[PDB]
Every structure is written in structure tokens, then in C-alpha cells.
Design a protein around this motif. Structure first.
Motif, mmCIF file in Angstrom:
data_model
loop_
_atom_site.group_PDB
_atom_site.id
_atom_site.type_symbol
_atom_site.label_atom_id
_atom_site.label_comp_id
_atom_site.label_asym_id
_atom_site.label_seq_id
_atom_site.Cartn_x
_atom_site.Cartn_y
_atom_site.Cartn_z
ATOM 1 N N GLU A 93 39.720 -11.638 -8.327
ATOM 2 C CA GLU A 93 41.145 -11.766 -8.606
ATOM 3 C C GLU A 93 41.740 -12.930 -7.850
ATOM 4 N N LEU A 94 41.334 -13.126 -6.608
ATOM 5 C CA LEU A 94 41.770 -14.309 -5.883
ATOM 6 C C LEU A 94 41.400 -15.595 -6.634
ATOM 7 N N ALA A 95 40.174 -15.681 -7.128
ATOM 8 C CA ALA A 95 39.751 -16.880 -7.831
ATOM 9 C C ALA A 95 40.685 -17.071 -9.043
ATOM 10 N N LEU A 96 40.965 -15.972 -9.743
ATOM 11 C CA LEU A 96 41.767 -15.983 -10.946
ATOM 12 C C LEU A 96 43.194 -16.460 -10.731
ATOM 13 N N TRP A 122 45.642 -6.519 -9.127
ATOM 14 C CA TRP A 122 45.896 -7.915 -8.826
ATOM 15 C C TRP A 122 45.621 -8.802 -10.036
ATOM 16 N N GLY A 123 45.818 -8.273 -11.250
ATOM 17 C CA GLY A 123 45.829 -9.084 -12.474
ATOM 18 C C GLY A 123 44.514 -9.320 -13.179
ATOM 19 N N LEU A 124 43.424 -8.800 -12.633
ATOM 20 C CA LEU A 124 42.128 -8.988 -13.288
ATOM 21 C C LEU A 124 42.229 -8.681 -14.771
ATOM 22 N N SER A 125 42.859 -7.571 -15.102
ATOM 23 C CA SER A 125 42.750 -7.092 -16.463
ATOM 24 C C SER A 125 43.593 -7.941 -17.412
#
Lengths: 220, 219, 223, 223, 219, 220
Positions: A93-96, A122-125
Motif C-alpha cells: 500500500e505504501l508503494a501504491l 490503506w487503499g489496496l483494494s
């Protein structure tokens, strides 16, 4: 010590630095990292931020040993992710969150949420399928299997892959090119891109949040 | 002379033609190009449009010497862009409007907006991420660097890269196949694609326009 | 016999099985296929579904020799992996686009003939094709009717993996096994969320796809 | 005793019951109230829920004397009618905004004090208040902190009906009875759909409401 | 003289002041008004803005004699509109931008766009339905008829109707209450309202702008 | 006979005319009505359409005795609904499709979908709350109770209420005002309004369609 910070040619590099814990994000490392980004926005000595990890891992994700609201702050300066090794789960998620990714041949990416029985907050999805495609995101999330650097390049998750020893040089080169352009325009344009993206992702991020609460509620 | 137009077997090819100014879009060339696309929509001799540039550049962007509201009209006939060389800034935006792109091995793509201190108003901030990915659009816009023909293919900006001398033949080939299909369905489907796309891009293009207004307002 | 169903360790495989008719979707096969997806969601013996076709075609589209085709892909919370063994054309391309995850044989290829035969789509091609192969490739596919090879589908992101033909089911079952090994409440709560997030984006497009198809039928009822 | 629950012929009435504290929502009362909404959805003896307060206030907002307040109104498929007996302020205005259907006593009045006390909302006021009273009235309410009378709420569309105080529950139970008399599978399938349609509109706003509240807390952690 | 401005106890009142031309917005009056709102956002002596017109009309619209991109700037301070009389077309659009409206008994509202053969570009086609309902916006726009102060109240366009001589006092009263609250929260909340609203209106305003371009293009 | 049509001063009035069946929409009346609207768009003699019913009812809804896809066509000419009596269920949906409503004191409005055990497919579940408000729409749909003309005026479902004998005169007056304006602008503006509205309602209409299919599937 747990986060390193260094500024050269107006490019500040933030390095996650608990390598023996594979750069897991403890409460301390979260506060220090997310605080360090916020400070870079307001610091007139900085134009670009690079984030990376002390080898061999970029980020193993949240310190699960120890244990979750989203904290990445509003930035108009670009953030380049220099991905030096495994980016897993919250680390993915940080990378994203990064505007631009560059990867070592050692980079790999994984989502283990379903494996460890949790849901992302944290927005992965939202951003995983946005940036690797719907089917690959679904294959990654449901199997929990690693995606390699080469495949991440193919799917459009990273912009470049280079040999391990060249990674930071490559990130610094992209940052130098940004630094050499008109910064009023860099930031105005990037702020606009964030607004246009946020407009598409808000509804989905709300649903991610609600799905996580409902999953936690029924498991409790 | 500045815009060439030729119609063949229901395919019209519009050629930007200021080679010595690298096909930079002047006020006069904007009017002829955008007007030509509008004429194409209503000319019953036309099923498909191909846009291209006189060598060696596709389009260098707006004519900055001389010197920007959007003017690409609503079309239900397909526009194939044959990118013969550099597509820069305003000119990348022309490429981005096209329904389908094919590139010469000589094509390359750049956004120099942030280098020259301007913000886009012809959809770059929406369509570039849409068509090359967020990461790459951001790397392009913020660096000003060229994306090669080959990388454009990998990223999905273009559908095909062919050697330079096969470019128009490659565009005409795709045109012929479209012409050979049922034109009622071709137009109804394309209109529907545009509508579905427009529903997703509208908000973003409005935000693009306001960002440009605020930026022009501070300076 | 027109649809095979088999269930092995929580993975149910549904094989479109009219090989000599290229797995064309007759009314009988649609009722059978869509019915089978529905059942799988309610069957407590199934965690993952794999759809595929009897060689050499995955699915040639609707039975046009036999021939208002409303959407019937049901709300599922279990993942559906498409193992594309050969050509997927038109309606059959739509079935593939519905899958959560695609894996292709080097034999797979993909095509939209709606404009060639003069019909508009009603199973989400106009939304999902651009979504999963990119706008320009979708427009070129739909408007020319040409085939997209397995290699190019991988390049475009339409499938996650291309393997040699005789490994196809092996590769789908390997992804199936990994999913089955994970926490299934989490697998389903996440997939469901993934589906809500996507649906929030596709819904306005699917309505417009349907209205376009109604308008096109009605102006041909004047010809 | 801080929350009353009673169930009469498939209608469950939940009465916020700290009258002498104006039905302020303490942590205990929140756990009790939200828990009770959850249960009602799973209870096969309940078709309709009515929420109301012990006179003379409906709900004064969160217990500020006692005082990160995340949203907890659960996903329901059964209708919830708000019988607003008196003042609904701030958090208590948010509880009313969550209801499917409001009926007011002439005693009802409504107010948002978030800006007066210097806090931002996290229970959907910033989305739903404009939605259900109009933009200008919502902005005037939130920014002045003034009370909206029952008469003006009816004029604005915030409530469906204003009745004399001693008829309030009678009027809520009459709407309850009619709903209960209808086909409950249809009542629920439609309400659910209504909720999905609304949610598709509110979701981007609720996320932005939450981000605004996070940003406001974080810049006050610099003061 | 064309725009009056007065600041009192952190409330700034901007008064359109061309009574003899019914406060019609000339090029010069547009520049002073829109510029005044922009100045207001950054002036630390200002918490709240009130806009009004010199009697007997609030705003007749654009100055059609003399003769239209949007220019209402992004604000985090509240703007209360005190509608003292007719608000017509462009001038209805000014009313629609305001965060809160209060009307004299003399206020009335009209959209004469379709009567004079123009399409709106300052948000009418989005904001009017938003604020009076679809039915009534459509009845207004297509007829050109006035909506009375009283009907404006019923429909939710305005928050209050007061006798003519109480208008400014009624606007100052609401201003005082806003000033008396915590200004950090007042601005953060208002910004959030604007953001949430903008997310819903963007697509529509883009469609409004394109419809206007196509209409100007055919004629 | 089942539909009346008459054109005066470029205003065409379409009258649902099975009064003894309370203007229920049979297959024949649907074809004839929706065909009559489509024809009015293309007929250069017409600027405005008014729709109404033969008394005492406007429309009782679909001919349920006899027994459903949406058919209201794309128009750029305005349609004024002159609501002379009860508008129920699919009949309420017809009213909801009109650009502008005017009502007799005899008008009333009801949604009986939940009462008769069906779900709407003609936009009720989107446009009802759009035009009467969320809570009133939910009160109407779930109780099935009538909404009066006066309350419909209050909630913004109709623009005007007049005595029964004045209804058509009132609709003709609003239409005459439209007719007297510039028709290129009337239609361009109305087309734009429809586009902006459609953009907000498409997602919701898709969900209405899906909800109905799922409800029918499980009941079968």
C-alpha cells in the motif's frame, strides 16, 4: 535511527530503517514516516521526495507482532518509490501511494490480507487494480502470491526496473529531471492530477473502509 | 498548403503540413484541422478519418512563437492517428483524442507543459493516465522526457508499431477493415464508447480546466 | 452433456461442451451455464469456480443459427477463473470479461464481431473491454473485428498468464489451490468489496450500453 | 435503562433514555443504540424499527462532558422511522439524518453546533444535511448554529410530517403498520435497492467528510 | 463607483452599483466583482462576505449592449447573497453561487437564456435544478417566467424572505452569528462542503460548457 | 380510440383514453403512447408535448390483469404532465418522466410496487427521491399510501396545483410561453439538462434494473 532522512540537490530521501525487522511499520515508524512526508511538503529546501527501504526488504507491512486508519498526507511535491525488495500488504500500500515507482530487480510485490485474515484500509483494494489491472489485482489478493519486478513492469505497477546496485541512482535521475523543471507548474500540475484521481477513488475508498468495519464487526 | 486533405474509398486523411515548423499548431492550423474534423462528421463520402503529420515530426504542439479552449468536436466516425514522429504537449493531446493509434518506429511522446510553465487544457491530465497508466503519466509530465514508440506499445498508448515506411499502409489497413463492417453498428457502437468514456472523463476535464484558470490567475 | 460440471477439493470446473459447434451459447447452454454459476454460489462444497471450454474453441459467441439478450451473469462472492483454451468471440469474449481472473493457452485468441454482424453488445463488452485491454485496443478490436493473440492479450493486461496448451488447466487449478488455502471469509469479504468498488464504476456505463442497444434495435425496427 | 427497547407486532421501538441529560450519547449509550440496530436486522420478530427519545429532547448530541468518533450506523434492510420528539443537535441531528423516514412533533427542532464548538462532523452531516434540507439551509444551519423549527423542516423536506406532540408515536406506528401490511420480501428488496442507489451517491462525499475531519484534527495537533 | 465595498467587524459587503443599468454586469463590473471576491479570500480582516445590488434590481445579467467563461473563485469564507430585487439570467447565476441566500419581498428570479437565444456558462443548468428542483428549473428556463420571493422560499432557493427594508439587517444578522463561531471550523467545514458539492457538480458543469460550445458553433 | 392526439398552437396533447379501465397501460397502450412521443420529436409541427388522462384517473399503472423494459424515448422537446387524477405505480413513473408537472386538485400519487409484491423498472426508485425527497419517497414506497396534490406541491413533485376544470388551460399556458421562446435554444438547453440529469441517474437506473432481475430470480 528507525527512519533515515537525507537531502541532496533538493531531493530528500526517506529510508525505512528497521532492516532486521524487514522494515515493518511499527507505531513509531508510522508516526515518523508520515510525519516526515508532511514536513517535506512544508520545507522549502525540498522539491522531490524519494522513499526506500534498508535492504533486503522494502517493507514487510504493519508490525503485526505489535498489533488502522489511513495517514498518507496531502502533498503537492512528487514522491518517487525506490522499491528495493519485497513490498508486502501494508508495504504494498505504501508503494501504491507513490506517484512514480522504480524497482530493483530484487523488487517483488504481494498482498497477504486474505492470507492473514484481514482487510485493507490503506487503499489496496482501490489502487491495486487501478495500477496493475483488475484481474492481476484479484489474482494477487486472493492467492497471496508474489509478483516479480519484471511482471510488475509489464502490468504498469512500476515505470522502470534496474539492477539492484543502480536503484537509487535511477530514482535520483528522475528526480533531477523534475527538479530542473518549473516547480510552480510541477506542483500545480501534480495537485491537479491528485484531485482528478481523488475524484475517481473516493467512493471506492469509502467502500473499502466500510467493508473493513463490517468484516471486523462480524469477526467480533 | 498547411493542412492536406485527401479522400479515398471512404477514408479521409488529414495531414498537418508545416514540416519546417514541425507541424506546430498555429491559430490558422487549429482552425483548419478542427474545422476539417467537423466537416468529416457530416460528409456522406466519409466513414473513417486518419490524421498524420508531414515528416519528421507528428506535432510539436501549439505555435509558441505566435502565442487555449478545447475544440476537438463530437464525432461518431472513427479517427485513427498515424504517429510519424515526435508528439509533444499540445500534439500529444491530439494523439490522445484519437480513437486508435498506430506508430512509426520513429514516434515518441512527451509532455513539456511543466517544463515550459503551463498547465494543460486539451485533456492531457485526464487522458494520459487513462492511456499509459498513472505512474508513467506522472513520470512523463514531471520529467518532460520522451516515451519511445516501443514503450508506448508496452504501456497501451498505441496498438501497433511498424517500420516508418509502412505507417500509412498500416493505418489504411485498419481503416479498410472498419469500412468493410456494418457502418450503422460501427457508428452506434462508437458513439456509445464515447458516451461511456465521457461519463468518466467529464469531472476530470472540468477540474483540468479550473486548475488551468487558477494557475493563469496567480501568474 | 452440453455443460460439464466437476468438483474436486472445493474447486468446481464448468466446461462449455459443444466442441463440434465451437461451444456456441444456445438458449439451453445459457440456461445451463448461468444456472450453474448461481448454484456454485450457494453450494457449501465450492470455494472457487473455473470456467473453460471443450477444445478447440473456448466460446464462439451466441448460437446465431438458433437466433433481446439481457445480462444474466449472477452476483457471486466466490472467485471465477477463466481458463481460455481457444477463441473467445463476441458473447464468448463477454463471458471471459466477466471472469475475475483469466489464464490463457497460447491457443487463446479474442475478438469482437458485434460491428461485423451489425449488432450492439448487452453483456458489458462496451464497458469491460476498454477496462481490461485499454481504450484504443478495445476500439480497434470492436471496429475491425480482428483477432487479438494470446501474446498481445498478456501485453495488454487482459489475461494474467499465457501457458502452453497442455498446461492450461494445471495453471488454473494452481491459482485455485492457493485461493482455497487462504482464509475463505476474508477471500469472500474482499472479493465482494472488490466487486462493489468495480460495480460503482461500471454501472453508469452498463446502463448506457443497454440504452444504446435499445436505441439501435428501435431504429432498425424502422428498416 | 439508558436505552429502552420494546417490540409490538413486528415493530421495535428504541427510545434513547437519559431524559435528565437530554439523551446525550455517552459511549455506553452508543454501544447500546448501535448494538440494538444491529440486532433488529437479524431478529425475525421485527419488520420495522422506530427510534425516538425520552421527552423533552430527542437527542442533544454526544456526551461532551465525557469526552475519534467513527461511523457506526449499520447496514440495515428494514426501514427505520425517526420520531423526533424534541431537539436533535449535532450528533443527534446525524442520527435523525440516518433515518429512512422522519416524523416530527411540533416540539422538534434541529441544529448543527459543530462549527460553534469547533469540530467537524464524521457521521455524515456534511453529506446528508444538504441532501435532505437543501444546500443553502444546510450551510446556514452549520455556519450559524441556529435552530430549525419543525414547521421549517417540513417546508424544507427534512421531515415527512409534523403532528401535535401527543400524537407523535401514534403517527410513527401508523406508518409502521402500513409498511408491516405490505409484502416484506418486496419491502426489503426495494429498501436495500434504495440504500445502494443512495450509497453510490454519498460514498465519495462521506470519504471526503472523513478526510476533512482527519486534516482538521491534525492541524489542531499543531496548536 | 460601479462596485461599492465596505468592511465592518469582519463582514465585507460588496454592492453592485449601476442602478440605472439595473446592475447589468459589464466587462469592467465583472472584473471588479470577481476580483473583489478573490481579494476577500486573502484579506485577514474578513470572515464573511455579503453581496447585494443597488435598488431596485439585484442583477439584470450580463451587459448585452456592450456584448463568457466562469470566474467565481474558490473561496473558504462564506458568501451570503442579499437579493434586493430582480435576479435575471447571468444574475441568477450570481445568486446560485452564493452559499446562503436571503431575499427581500421584492426579489424575483428568472432565466431568460432560451428567450434571448443563448445557453448558460456560469452553472445555471446544474445549480438551478440543484436548488429549486428539476421540475421548477425546467419550468423557469423554458418559460422565462419570474419565480416570486415567496415561491423561492417554498422551493428552497432562499432561506428567508423579509420585508424590503430589513434585508441587509437580516444578512448582517446571519453574518454576525457566523463570525461568532470558531473560524477555523467554519472555514474547514465550508471548504469541505464545497469539495463534496464540486465532486457532484463537475461533470455537469463540463457538459454545460460543451453544450454551450456546440450551440455557439452551429450559429 | 385508446390514445387521443390533438395539436393546437404547436402544442400536441396526448391523452391516455381507457377511462373505464382507469387508463391502465396495456401492451397496446404502451406501444401507442411511446410511439406517439417518438413521433412528436420528429414532427416539425410540434414544439411541446402535453400528456394527460381521461378522467377520473391519470394512470392506474400497467394492465396487471393482462400481465417490463423502459421505453420512454430520447426527446429534446419538452413534455408537460397534466395530472388529472391518481398516478399510481407505473403511472407514477410516467409522471416522473415528464420535464414539468402541473396537477389538478384531484391529483394524487402512490407507489404500490411493494404492496403488490413487485419492483420498479421504469425509474421510480431513482426519480421519486430525486423529485419528492429521500424520506417522502421511502414513506410512499414502503407504505403504499397516497400523496395528495397539496403535499406533492410542497415536496416539489409538481410545480403548480389548480382547480380541476382549469388543469389543461394551465398546461397550455406554460406551453405557450415555451412556444414563444427561441426553439433552437429551448431544445439545446433541454437536451443539455437531460444529459446532465442522465449522467447522475444512469448508475442508479442500472442498479434498479439489477435489483429487479435479482428479485424476480429468487421469487422464481
Amino acid at each position: 535511527e528507525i527512519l533515515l532522512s537525507n537531502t541532496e540537490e533538493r531531493v530528500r530521501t526517506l529510508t525505512l530503517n528497521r532492516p532486521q525487522a524487514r522494515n515493518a511499520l511499527s507505531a513509531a515508524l508510522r508516526d515518523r514516516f508520515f510525519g516526515a512526508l508532511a514536513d517535506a511538503e512544508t520545507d522549502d529546501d525540498v522539491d522531490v521526495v524519494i522513499i526506500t527501504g534498508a535492504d533486503p526488504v522494502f517493507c514487510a507491512g504493519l508490525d503485526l507482532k505489535e498489533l488502522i486508519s489511513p495517514r498518507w498526507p496531502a502533498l503537492t511535491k512528487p514522491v518517487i518509490g525506490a522499491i528495493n525488495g519485497a513490498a508486502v500488504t501494508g508495504g504494498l500500500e505504501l508503494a501504491l501511494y507513490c506517484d512514480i515507482l522504480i524497482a530493483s530487480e530484487n523488487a517483488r510485490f504481494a498482498d497477504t490480507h486474505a492470507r492473514v485474515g484481514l482487510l485493507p484500509t490503506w487503499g489496496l483494494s482501490v489502487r491495486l487494480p487501478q495500477k496493475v489491472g483488475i484481474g492481476l489485482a484479484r489474482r494477487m489478493s486472493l492467492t497471496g502470491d508474489y509478483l516479480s519486478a519484471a511482471d510488475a513492469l509489464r502490468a504498469g505497477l512500476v515505470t522502470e526496473v534496474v539492477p539492484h546496485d543502480q536503484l537509487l541512482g535511477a530514482a535520483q535521475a528522475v528526480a533531477a529531471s523534475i527538479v530542473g523543471n518549473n516547480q510552480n507548474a510541477v506542483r500545480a500540475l501534480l495537485a491537479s492530477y491528485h484531485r482528478i484521481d481523488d475524484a475517481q477513488t473516493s467512493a471506492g475508498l469509502w467502500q473499502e473502509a466500510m467493508a473493513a468495519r463490517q468484516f471486523r464487526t462480524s469477526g467480533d
